[PDB]
């Protein structure tokens, strides 16, 4: 169950200072959950 996740497209490709992705969803990008 070692997956990678996140909102595809425009939301993620903004720099992290935009804070558009929820923090819970944004932390599933390193392989967690």
């Amino acid at each position: 169950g070692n997956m990678v996740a996140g909102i595809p497209g425009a939301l993620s490709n903004q720099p992290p200072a935009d804070a558009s992705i929820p923090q819970d969803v944004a932390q599933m990008k390193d392989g967690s959950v």
Binding site: V4, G6, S12, K29
Partner: protein, 109 residues
């Protein structure tokens, strides 16, 4: 010395390897927008040697990702899929002739 391994050469293994490469390339194209996905690559020399006498690598990005962590260069993936498809067909023509050459020698016609 008459044996399928000696007659079919490495072409009996190359077809399976290039099919594996097509799957690895296709899943990179499909997962192009998935963030956190690292583009995967399959070494042909290692995979062919492993098949001959009885674990996909990572593809380094040419430019940094735009904040999603995905390192799939969809421009590059299309080029590799096209090349693999042509080389896959060439191996099919090589392997297919191996059986046809055996049949015409056996049947004498």
């Amino acid at each position: 010395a008459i044996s399928f391994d000696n007659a079919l050469g490495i072409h009996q293994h190359t077809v399976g390897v290039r099919e594996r490469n097509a799957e690895v390339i296709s899943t990179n194209i499909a997962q192009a927008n998935t963030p956190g996905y690292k583009a995967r690559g399959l070494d042909f020399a290692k995979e062919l040697q492993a098949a001959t006498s009885g674990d996909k690598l990572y593809r380094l990005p040419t430019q940094p990702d735009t904040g999603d962590g995905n390192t799939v260069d969809l421009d590059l993936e299309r080029n590799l899929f096209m090349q693999n498809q042509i080389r896959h067909q060439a191996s099919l023509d090589f392997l297919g002739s191996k059986f046809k050459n055996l049949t015409k020698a056996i049947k004498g016609e």
